[PDB]
Design a protein around this ligand. Structure first.
Ligand SMILES: [Hg+2]
Length: 99
């Protein structure tokens, strides 16, 4: 599935921000507008036993240019909350369900 980082009008959102995938499906996060952007999974809000470090950028890593991508595949079933660290407060958050 392709997820835009920043809407085409510059709003600080993941597009889409809520979505479902099957195990092993790759999410391609695409730097679009309003950067810098990153993707960080909340360790307290992902399935038990999942290593956040495997599926997240570092809070310190940033995508600074249009078209940079971050790709990840999830396999454990359940709900995954994620956010962009620099824009968390602006509401740039999302949740993926693996079902
Ligand atoms: Hg962001």
């Amino acid at each position: 599935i392709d997820v835009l980082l920043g809407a085409d009008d510059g709003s600080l959102a993941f597009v889409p921000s809520e979505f479902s995938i099957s195990p092993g499906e790759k999410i391609v996060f695409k730097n679009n507008a309003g950067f810098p952007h990153n993707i960080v999974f909340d360790e307290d809000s992902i399935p038990s036993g999942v290593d956040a470090s495997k599926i997240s950028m570092s809070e310190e890593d940033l995508l600074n240019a249009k078209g940079e991508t971050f790709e990840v595949a999830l396999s454990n079933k359940g709900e995954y909350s994620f956010y962009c660290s620099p824009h968390q407060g602006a509401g740039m958050v999302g949740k993926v369900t693996v079902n």
